[PDB]
Design an enzyme around this catalytic site. Structure first.
Site, PDB file in Angstrom:
ATOM      1  N   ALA A  17       3.591 -17.534  91.172  1.00 34.82           N
ATOM      2  CA  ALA A  17       4.742 -17.859  92.015  1.00 34.82           C
ATOM      3  C   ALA A  17       4.749 -19.333  92.370  1.00 34.82           C
ATOM      4  O   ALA A  17       5.112 -19.715  93.489  1.00 34.82           O
ATOM      5  CB  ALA A  17       4.771 -17.012  93.285  1.00 34.82           C
ATOM      6  N   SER A  46       1.183 -22.438  96.471  1.00 33.91           N
ATOM      7  CA  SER A  46       0.829 -22.717  95.074  1.00 33.91           C
ATOM      8  C   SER A  46       0.685 -24.214  94.822  1.00 33.91           C
ATOM      9  O   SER A  46       1.340 -25.035  95.468  1.00 33.91           O
ATOM     10  CB  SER A  46       1.890 -22.150  94.142  1.00 33.91           C
ATOM     11  N   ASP A 223      -6.691 -18.133  85.879  1.00 37.21           N
ATOM     12  CA  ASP A 223      -6.818 -16.674  85.891  1.00 37.21           C
ATOM     13  C   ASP A 223      -5.991 -16.007  84.798  1.00 37.21           C
ATOM     14  O   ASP A 223      -6.406 -14.987  84.232  1.00 37.21           O
ATOM     15  CB  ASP A 223      -6.404 -16.122  87.252  1.00 37.21           C
ATOM     16  N   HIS A 244      -5.914 -37.791  85.677  1.00 38.89           N
ATOM     17  CA  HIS A 244      -4.939 -38.638  86.337  1.00 38.89           C
ATOM     18  C   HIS A 244      -5.619 -39.943  86.731  1.00 38.89           C
ATOM     19  O   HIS A 244      -6.767 -39.929  87.192  1.00 38.89           O
ATOM     20  CB  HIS A 244      -4.349 -37.966  87.577  1.00 38.89           C
ATOM     21  N   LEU A 254      -4.775 -36.443  95.114  1.00 39.54           N
ATOM     22  CA  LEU A 254      -3.910 -37.223  94.245  1.00 39.54           C
ATOM     23  C   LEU A 254      -3.198 -38.311  95.042  1.00 39.54           C
ATOM     24  O   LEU A 254      -2.596 -38.041  96.088  1.00 39.54           O
ATOM     25  CB  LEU A 254      -2.877 -36.321  93.562  1.00 39.54           C
ATOM     26  N   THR A 256      -0.083 -40.573  94.138  1.00 37.79           N
ATOM     27  CA  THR A 256       0.907 -40.411  93.076  1.00 37.79           C
ATOM     28  C   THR A 256       1.003 -41.640  92.179  1.00 37.79           C
ATOM     29  O   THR A 256       0.688 -42.766  92.580  1.00 37.79           O
ATOM     30  CB  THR A 256       2.296 -40.110  93.643  1.00 37.79           C
ATOM     31  N   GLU A 257       1.432 -41.396  90.933  1.00 36.11           N
ATOM     32  CA  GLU A 257       1.732 -42.459  89.973  1.00 36.11           C
ATOM     33  C   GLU A 257       2.995 -43.221  90.365  1.00 36.11           C
ATOM     34  O   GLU A 257       3.247 -44.314  89.842  1.00 36.11           O
ATOM     35  CB  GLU A 257       1.876 -41.841  88.574  1.00 36.11           C
TER      36      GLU A 257
HETATM   37  C1  LIG Z   1      -2.608 -30.962  91.216  1.00 33.29           C
HETATM   38  C2  LIG Z   1      -1.308 -31.729  91.159  1.00 33.29           C
HETATM   39  C3  LIG Z   1      -0.453 -31.520  90.087  1.00 33.29           C
HETATM   40  C4  LIG Z   1       0.746 -32.225  90.013  1.00 33.29           C
HETATM   41  C5  LIG Z   1       1.133 -33.163  91.015  1.00 33.29           C
HETATM   42  C6  LIG Z   1       0.266 -33.356  92.087  1.00 33.29           C
HETATM   43  C7  LIG Z   1      -0.945 -32.660  92.167  1.00 33.29           C
HETATM   44  C8  LIG Z   1      -1.859 -32.903  93.344  1.00 33.29           C
HETATM   45  N1  LIG Z   1       2.308 -33.856  90.944  1.00 33.29           N
HETATM   46  C9  LIG Z   1       3.134 -33.643  89.914  1.00 33.29           C
HETATM   47  C10 LIG Z   1       4.380 -34.323  89.799  1.00 33.29           C
HETATM   48  O1  LIG Z   1       4.739 -35.142  90.680  1.00 33.29           O
HETATM   49  N2  LIG Z   1       5.211 -34.106  88.771  1.00 33.29           N
HETATM   50  C11 LIG Z   1       4.840 -33.225  87.822  1.00 33.29           C
HETATM   51  O2  LIG Z   1       5.598 -33.021  86.849  1.00 33.29           O
HETATM   52  N3  LIG Z   1       3.664 -32.551  87.876  1.00 33.29           N
HETATM   53  C12 LIG Z   1       2.811 -32.723  88.895  1.00 33.29           C
HETATM   54  N4  LIG Z   1       1.593 -32.021  88.961  1.00 33.29           N
HETATM   55  C13 LIG Z   1       1.219 -31.032  87.944  1.00 33.29           C
HETATM   56  C14 LIG Z   1       2.087 -29.824  88.301  1.00 33.29           C
HETATM   57  O3  LIG Z   1       2.363 -29.773  89.715  1.00 33.29           O
HETATM   58  C15 LIG Z   1       1.431 -28.523  87.899  1.00 33.29           C
HETATM   59  O4  LIG Z   1       1.130 -28.619  86.505  1.00 33.29           O
HETATM   60  C16 LIG Z   1       2.399 -27.377  88.148  1.00 33.29           C
HETATM   61  O5  LIG Z   1       2.980 -27.434  89.464  1.00 33.29           O
HETATM   62  C17 LIG Z   1       1.796 -26.003  87.993  1.00 33.29           C
HETATM   63  O6  LIG Z   1       2.872 -25.130  88.314  1.00 33.29           O
HETATM   64  P1  LIG Z   1       2.769 -23.603  87.879  1.00 33.29           P
HETATM   65  O7  LIG Z   1       3.895 -22.752  88.358  1.00 33.29           O
HETATM   66  O8  LIG Z   1       2.519 -23.584  86.380  1.00 33.29           O
HETATM   67  O9  LIG Z   1       1.394 -23.125  88.603  1.00 33.29           O
HETATM   68  P2  LIG Z   1       0.890 -23.358  90.133  1.00 33.29           P
HETATM   69  O10 LIG Z   1       1.861 -24.084  91.020  1.00 33.29           O
HETATM   70  O11 LIG Z   1      -0.547 -23.827  90.023  1.00 33.29           O
HETATM   71  O12 LIG Z   1       0.873 -21.850  90.679  1.00 33.29           O
HETATM   72  C18 LIG Z   1       0.021 -20.865  90.109  1.00 33.29           C
HETATM   73  C19 LIG Z   1       0.548 -19.527  90.610  1.00 33.29           C
HETATM   74  O13 LIG Z   1      -0.063 -18.448  89.880  1.00 33.29           O
HETATM   75  C20 LIG Z   1      -0.578 -17.507  90.794  1.00 33.29           C
HETATM   76  N5  LIG Z   1      -1.874 -16.967  90.346  1.00 33.29           N
HETATM   77  C21 LIG Z   1      -2.937 -17.672  89.948  1.00 33.29           C
HETATM   78  N6  LIG Z   1      -3.952 -16.821  89.644  1.00 33.29           N
HETATM   79  C22 LIG Z   1      -3.496 -15.575  89.864  1.00 33.29           C
HETATM   80  C23 LIG Z   1      -4.086 -14.222  89.741  1.00 33.29           C
HETATM   81  N7  LIG Z   1      -5.371 -14.033  89.335  1.00 33.29           N
HETATM   82  N8  LIG Z   1      -3.304 -13.168  90.070  1.00 33.29           N
HETATM   83  C24 LIG Z   1      -2.048 -13.405  90.489  1.00 33.29           C
HETATM   84  N9  LIG Z   1      -1.458 -14.571  90.622  1.00 33.29           N
HETATM   85  C25 LIG Z   1      -2.178 -15.676  90.323  1.00 33.29           C
HETATM   86  C26 LIG Z   1      -0.837 -18.250  92.095  1.00 33.29           C
HETATM   87  O14 LIG Z   1      -0.694 -17.401  93.244  1.00 33.29           O
HETATM   88  C27 LIG Z   1       0.208 -19.333  92.080  1.00 33.29           C
HETATM   89  O15 LIG Z   1       1.365 -18.864  92.771  1.00 33.29           O
HETATM   90  O1  LIG Z   2       1.251 -35.029  87.069  1.00 33.39           O
HETATM   91  C1  LIG Z   2       2.378 -35.572  87.166  1.00 33.39           C
HETATM   92  O2  LIG Z   2       3.421 -35.237  86.541  1.00 33.39           O
HETATM   93  C2  LIG Z   2       2.501 -36.734  88.101  1.00 33.39           C
HETATM   94  C3  LIG Z   2       1.615 -36.899  89.306  1.00 33.39           C
HETATM   95  O3  LIG Z   2       0.683 -36.149  89.576  1.00 33.39           O
HETATM   96  C4  LIG Z   2       1.930 -38.042  90.139  1.00 33.39           C
HETATM   97  O4  LIG Z   2       2.796 -37.903  91.036  1.00 33.39           O
HETATM   98  O5  LIG Z   2       1.333 -39.116  89.891  1.00 33.39           O
END
Ligand SMILES: *Cc1cc2c(cc1C)nc1c(=O)[nH]c(=O)nc-1n2C[C@H](O)[C@H](O)[C@H](O)COP(=O)(O)OP(=O)(O)OC[C@H]1O[C@@H](n2cnc3c(N)ncnc32)[C@H](O)[C@@H]1O
Ligand SMILES: O=C([O-])CC(=O)C(=O)O
Ligand SMILES: CCCCCCCCCCCCCCCCCC(=O)OC[C@H](COP(=O)(O)OCCN)OC(=O)CCCCCCCCCCCCCCCCC
Ligand code: HEM
Ligand SMILES: CCCCCCCCCCCO[C@@H]1O[C@H](CO)[C@@H](O[C@H]2O[C@H](CO)[C@@H](O)[C@H](O)[C@H]2O)[C@H](O)[C@H]1O
Ligand SMILES: CC(C)Oc1cccc(NC(=O)c2ccccc2C(F)(F)F)c1
Ligand code: SF4
Ligand code: F3S
Ligand code: FES
Ligand SMILES: [K+]
Ligand SMILES: [Mn+2]
Lengths: 612, 139, 102, 240
Positions: A17, A46, A223, A244, A254, A256-257
């Site tokens: 989610a 998340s 997971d 990063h 983080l 940010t970039e």
């Molecule tokens: C770490 C990070 C990444 C990031 C960022 C800043 C940080 C600190 N800034 C970004 C940005 O400005 N622009 C961008 O394009 N990307 C950026 N990133 C990377 C990006 O945020 C992530 O790659 C992305 O948000 C991941 O999103 P996704 O929907 O794929 O996954 P998630 O937000 O990590 O949520 C995972 C969900 O899955 C559920 N989950 C996990 N394990 C389980 C199990 N075992 N059972 C059930 N559900 C599960 C979690 O609950 C969660 O909701």
């Molecule tokens: O991962 C990305 O897309 C970008 C990111 O973390 C940032 O804000 O620097």
């Protein structure tokens, strides 16, 4: 078993989610499918919520743009391990995806025309790499992911999606190569739930917590990646881990970039803006793999900053305080809390930090998960994946900043769209054998009552320090081999685990032991795939194989070149498999897709030298 | 696929019949001057009301009228300190509640909501209350 | 009206303001007019205020109706006695003066 | 060579029949621990008592998961500096006046249902045109959302409000109310009046008596009390 098993039946089940899972889940309900969203966290906790810099879309709000320029940036950014059909779909859909978000209520920052404000970001150009810095990263100040996730969560409340919050998915229910749903644990009350469904969507995030220092949430434990592995399916390109450039020193958080996109510069202990030397053109806005390698050489050579000469400075203070307060308020607060830095006077201490997983569950461009038998891809019936957990692969060997949040909503919506065009709501739910999923209960119960030598937190730490030193920015063959040995021994050492909490309700001792199983399956495939990939591509840099090895020497005229055979070059995806009893990894490889969805609309971009 | 009302009712059904504890609150939460001053605004409000209603009931029910009970008290030839202390005790709740009432009517305009301003207007209320009470009990 | 709750909130503030203005009026122009206006405002302000206390703290349909019905009786008797005092005795302003000359 | 700090943490186990809440004291060497209370709770869980249970995820104060009551006030364990005065034991409790699922984990789903109830999503009259173009919004009208949209729904403010303690069944609380205002003044939203209409009852908004504990406790520096007071001004002035 002594666990009351509760059976559910849905059209579709979405595991996750974050951005991806939310957009897939209500897209399906919107399409009239009775959908379940299974998530182990409440949706707005998340990791998507932590995202800062923005989401790319060629909206043309700051200059004339063209989504094919974003296409080219992403293909060149991926270093030609990216699938250009998926990248075509992701960059063409980007304006409509970001416009959808704004119309949902996302409080984007604004320009003087009242449109969505966009900033520069690393490795993005105008006119196919020739026309200067692009400004297409759409942002909500430096809180873009926070606002994207809360907007998407708020939007999902309008549909009849059945949410199962704080349920921990354990395994997929497989029958005859098709997915029949997922089995899960209700954390709030200790009960086991089987979710039967015609289609399953895996949006479970990355696995940055296989490492010792990451920007990632504690909950980023791979997971859904591990469920695929345990089902006998391949994962793809897991050795490609993104560092990063700027995780804040110590805590890892983080920065940010967008700090560099707004004018921030990196300086070393001599005050040199060293990226002017490593990347003459892009400087501090080169690709992340290049900026992270640059920062790393300055430190180990001997120009690190701080009392230990082990980080570098991210200087913002030369910029107007009002820009820093309008564009970068989030990291201004975080720099003070987690480093005591006031950004208008002193720099931020930063270093390359594990941040994002390029690899994932292999899909096609429609979101469908694939396996690879005898040189052809085969869609896995009933099984989809989007977001960071997926390998589309729009990012190949190195993701462009601000492409992930885009990926989330484009391919989350693609999974909904593809199921909508492929299946009808209400179709008969597939039968699962009466005992389907009982090996997941048996494993869970063995961990609940484990009582050995090596407590969970001790083994997690042995994994994180092993990945941190043996699979870092720079890798060699001998160091990766010793990390393969250390990991395989740690993985067998799991037979020695000890837990203390014998309860079943909110037993995070047990859940974090499950995440450790998940984390290790991800870690083994990452480092073994790394040791085998004897080349340098994107974020994977071998100092004993410093060249990119493609099917031709694309640094020379191609006329009169003997094409290298598939088995003698590395322009191919890694496919990884794990025998989960032994811990033994098996590697196969599949071709990179170079064709687009329409050659006349968007030219395929052949490999080339890659410089910033 | 549950509405917010159904979720609310399920929450109370589930929890009020459970073995779950209610986590502590008044016994564990740390004090502030705004908080203590909010309690005191309620207490002086209720005290003023109940005193106003006792006066009204004594008007309907006592055998004699007001100037007798004043003459009664004047005949007791009480000390100035005891007169002053009684007057102060009587006007102090009225004084507190009136000034803090004014501070509330400012808030209702949306002014004074920064936390440091909540602290400033609190202390300003305390000193105007003390000054007006001491002065009026000396009249 | 279907704006009952915010019209009440506004009346509360209106009446509180009125009562504020009566305090200088009582010290400056004491007499029948301020006496009965104090009788009205004192009772109305106290009645609404004690009903906020009840709304906050009393729960259940029957305790709520009981608390509130007793509050009407307290308020009705309070306004009655203050008017009695103003008509048959010396009235509010004069009573305070006499007390303060003790 | 070490500085031992004492933490006294609320404990309860639903899987123990007849378990009554207790407090357990842990000793932690601050020289071998990060600077934040969540760092101490993770250290205690990993090293001394893996049965100690609590919510956490982001460890940088952005996800809202780790809201609890530390040293008397609701805050985020992951941004709350450890108090290094070793003569003082830090007391750690769940968010106040909530049903305790286990240890430091409260049941937040009524809180979540109250947020759902105010419809926290952009609404337009003619929505047939959505997905086509970006809505225009001035820099000035976007600035009105600053200090409102940053809310992380940690429930620190609402679970510090005494009104929400006595009437949390019917009073929406400062978190949800400030978000209702976040949508009331979004210049793209067309349902400002329906959103005000919904608060026309004795409880949803009017249990707020301006105690200002919400603003003291918010770990994002936001001001839900101020937002509730602007809602109140709008309630008294709008026309049907
Ligand atoms: C770490 C990070 C990444 C990031 C960022 C800043 C940080 C600190 N800034 C970004 C940005 O400005 N622009 C961008 O394009 N990307 C950026 N990133 C990377 C990006 O945020 C992530 O790659 C992305 O948000 C991941 O999103 P996704 O929907 O794929 O996954 P998630 O937000 O990590 O949520 C995972 C969900 O899955 C559920 N989950 C996990 N394990 C389980 C199990 N075992 N059972 C059930 N559900 C599960 C979690 O609950 C969660 O909701
Ligand atoms: O991962 C990305 O897309 C970008 C990111 O973390 C940032 O804000 O620097
Ligand atoms: C048992 C009930 C106890 C609690 C009930 C609460 C009641 C609150 C409502 C009371 C409002 C009435 C206020 C009226 C004040 C003015 C009336 C007046 O004319 O009193 C005169 C006296 C000062 O007299 P002097 O200095 O000689 O000058 C007179 C020239 N106009 O004025 C004064 O100096 C005295 C003012 C003090 C009022 C305190 C009231 C007690 C509370
Ligand atoms: C003589 C007075 C009496 C008997 C009286 C009584 C009360 C009572 C019983 C309350 C309810 C308290 C609560 O709900 O916590 C109250 C509240 C209030 N009073 Fe008075 N009061 C008097 C004078 C004044 C004056 C002169 C002002 C100016 C004032 C301003 C207010 C305000 C603004 C409130 C609102 C409380 C809130 O919003 O929580 N009062 N009063
Ligand atoms: C009519 C008489 C009614 C009022 C008198 C009652 C006296 C009891 C008041 C108890 C106040 O208790 C005290 O309040 C102060 C100021 O808000 C608190 O101070 C707190 O907030 C302020 C800022 O707002 C900070 O400077 C300070 O470091 C912090 O701890 C303090 O922690 C608390 O211990
Ligand atoms: C922890 C302590 C100091 O904290 C407490 C404890 C008990 C009650 C309260 N304060 C109220 O009860 C109060 C006070 C004035 C106005 C409205 C209220 C109300 F609405 F009921 F919440 C505060
Ligand atoms: S307003 Fe402040 S405290 Fe209340 S929920 Fe949002 S962030 Fe958490
Ligand atoms: S503390 Fe509570 S009473 Fe109102 S001003 Fe804040 S919601
Ligand atoms: S763990 Fe995310 S807010 Fe503290
Ligand atoms: K990925
Ligand atoms: Mn062994």
């Amino acid at each position: 078993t002594q666990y009351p098993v509760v059976d559910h039946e849905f059209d579709a089940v979405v595991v996750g989610a974050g951005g991806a899972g939310l957009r897939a889940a209500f897209g399906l309900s919107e399409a009239g499918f009775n959908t379940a969203c299974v998530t182990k966290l409440f949706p707005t906790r998340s990791h998507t919520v932590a995202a800062q810099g923005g989401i790319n879309a060629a909206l043309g709000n700051m200059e004339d743009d063209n989504w094919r320029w974003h296409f080219y940036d992403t293909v060149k950014g991926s270093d030609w391990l990216g699938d250009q059909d998926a990248i075509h779909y992701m960059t063409e859909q980007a304006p409509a995806a970001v416009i959808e978000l704004e119309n949902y209520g996302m409080p984007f920052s604004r320009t003087e025309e009242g449109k969505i404000y966009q900033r520069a970001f690393g490795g993005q150009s105008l006119q196919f790499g020739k026309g200067g810095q692009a400004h297409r990263c759409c942002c909500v100040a430096d809180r873009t992911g926070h606002s994207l996730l809360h907007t998407l969560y708020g939007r999902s409340l309008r549909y009849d999606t059945s949410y199962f919050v704080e349920y921990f998915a354990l395994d997929l229910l497989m029958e005859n190569g098709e997915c029949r749903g997922v089995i899960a644990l209700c954390i709030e009350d200790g009960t086991i739930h089987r979710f039967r469904a015609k289609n399953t969507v895996i949006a479970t995030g990355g696995y940055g917590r296989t490492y010792f220092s990451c920007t990632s949430a504690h909950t980023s434990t791979g997971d859904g990646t591990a469920m695929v592995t345990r089902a006998g399916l391949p994962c793809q390109d897991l050795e490609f881990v993104q560092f990063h450039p700027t995780g804040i020193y110590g805590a890892g958080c983080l920065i940010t970039e967008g700090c560099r996109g707004e004018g921030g510069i990196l300086i070393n202990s001599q005050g040199e803006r060293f990226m002017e030397r490593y990347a003459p053109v892009a400087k501090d806005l080169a690709s992340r793999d290049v900026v992270s390698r640059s920062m790393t050489i300055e430190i180990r050579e001997g120009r690190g900053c701080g009392p230990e000469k082990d980080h570098v400075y991210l200087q913002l203070h030369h910029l107007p305080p009002q820009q820093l307060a309008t564009r970068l308020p989030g990291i201004s607060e975080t720099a003070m809390i987690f480093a005591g830095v006031d950004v208008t006077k002193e720099p931020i201490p930063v270093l390359p930090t594990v941040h994002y997983n390029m690899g994932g569950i292999p899909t096609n461009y429609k979101g469908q998960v694939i396996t690879h038998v005898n040189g052809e891809d085969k869609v896995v019936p009933g099984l989809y994946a989007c977001g960071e957990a997926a390998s589309a692969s729009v990012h190949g060997a190195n993701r462009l900043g601000a492409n992930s949040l885009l990926d989330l909503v484009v391919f989350g919506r693609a999974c909904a769209l593809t199921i909508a065009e492929t299946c009808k709501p209400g179709e008969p739910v597939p039968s699962i054998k009466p005992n389907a999923g009982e090996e997941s209960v048996a494993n869970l119960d063995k961990l609940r009552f484990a009582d050995g030598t090596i407590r969970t937190s001790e083994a997690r730490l042995n994994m994180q320090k092993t990945m941190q030193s043996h699979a870092a920015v720079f890798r060699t063959g001998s160091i990766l081999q010793e990390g393969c040995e250390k990991l395989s021994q740690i993985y067998r050492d799991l037979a020695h685990l000890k837990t203390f909490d014998r309860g079943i309700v909110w037993n995070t001792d047990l859940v974090e032991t499950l995440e450790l199983q998940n984390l290790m399956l991800c870690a083994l495939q990452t480092i073994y795939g790394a040791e085998a990939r004897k080349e340098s591509r994107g974020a994977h840099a071998r100092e004993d194989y410093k060249l990119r090895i493609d099917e031709f020497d694309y640094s020379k005229p191609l006329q009169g070149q003997q094409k290298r055979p598939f088995e003698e070059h590395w322009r191919k995806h890694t496919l990884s498999y794990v025998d989960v009893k032994s811990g033994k990894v098996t590697l196969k490889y599949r071709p990179v897709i170079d064709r687009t969805l329409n050659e006349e609309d968007c030219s395929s971009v052949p490999p080339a030298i890659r410089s910033y | 696929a549950t509405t917010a009302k159904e979720e609310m009712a399920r929450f109370w059904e589930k929890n009020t019949k459970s073995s779950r504890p209610l986590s502590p609150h008044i016994s564990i939460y740390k004090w502030s001057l705004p908080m203590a001053m909010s309690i005191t605004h309620r207490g002086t409000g209720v005290a003023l009301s109940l005193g106003v209603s006792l006066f009204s009931l004594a008007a309907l029910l006592l055998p004699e009228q007001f100037p007798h009970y004043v003459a009664v008290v004047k005949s007791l030839s009480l000390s100035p300190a005891l007169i002053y202390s009684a007057k102060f005790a009587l006007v102090f709740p009225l004084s507190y509640h009136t000034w803090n009432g004014i501070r509330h009517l400012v808030w209702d305009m949306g002014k004074g909501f920064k936390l440091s301003q909540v602290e400033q207007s609190g202390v300003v209320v305390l000193i105007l209350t003390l000054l007006s009470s001491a002065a009026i009990a000396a009249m | 009206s279907s704006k009952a709750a915010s019209l009440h909130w506004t009346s509360e503030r209106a009446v509180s303001a009125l009562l504020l203005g009566l305090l200088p009026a009582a010290y400056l122009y004491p007499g029948p007019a301020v006496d009965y206006s104090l009788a009205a405002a004192l009772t109305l302000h106290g009645h609404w205020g004690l009903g906020q206390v009840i709304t906050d703290y009393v729960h259940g349909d029957t305790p709520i109706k009981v608390a509130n019905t007793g509050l009407y009786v307290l308020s009705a008797i309070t306004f009655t006695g203050l008017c009695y005092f103003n008509y048959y005795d010396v009235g509010i302003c004069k009573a305070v003066a006499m007390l303060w000359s003790i | 060579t070490s500085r031992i700090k004492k933490f006294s943490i609320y404990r309860w186990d639903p899987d123990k029949p007849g378990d009554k809440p207790r407090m357990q004291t842990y000793e932690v060497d601050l020289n071998k621990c990060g600077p934040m209370v969540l760092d101490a709770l993770i250290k205690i869980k990993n090293e001394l008592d893996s049965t100690l249970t609590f919510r956490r995820s982001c460890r940088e104060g952005i996800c809202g998961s780790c809201a609890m009551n530390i040293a008397g006030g609701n805050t985020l364990a992951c941004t709350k500096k450890i108090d290094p005065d070793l003569s003082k034991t830090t007391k750690i409790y769940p968010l106040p006046h909530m049903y305790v699922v286990k240890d430091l984990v409260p049941d937040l789903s009524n809180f979540y249902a109250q947020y759902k109830s105010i419809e926290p999503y952009l609404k337009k009259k003619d929505e047939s045109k959505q997905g086509k173009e970006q809505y225009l919004q001035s820099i000035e009208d976007r600035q009105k959302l600053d200090g409102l949209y940053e809310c992380i729904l940690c429930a620190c403010c609402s679970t510090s409000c005494p009104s929400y303690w006595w009437n949390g069944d019917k009073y929406l609380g400062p978190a949800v109310l400030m978000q209702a205002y976040r949508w009331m003044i979004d210049s793209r939203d067309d349902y400002t009046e329906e959103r005000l209409a919904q608060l026309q009852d004795p409880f949803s908004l009017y249990r707020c008596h301006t105690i200002m504990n919400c603003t003291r406790t918010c770990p994002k520096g936001l001001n839900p009390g101020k937002a509730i007071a602007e809602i109140k001004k709008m309630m008294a002035t709008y026309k049907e």
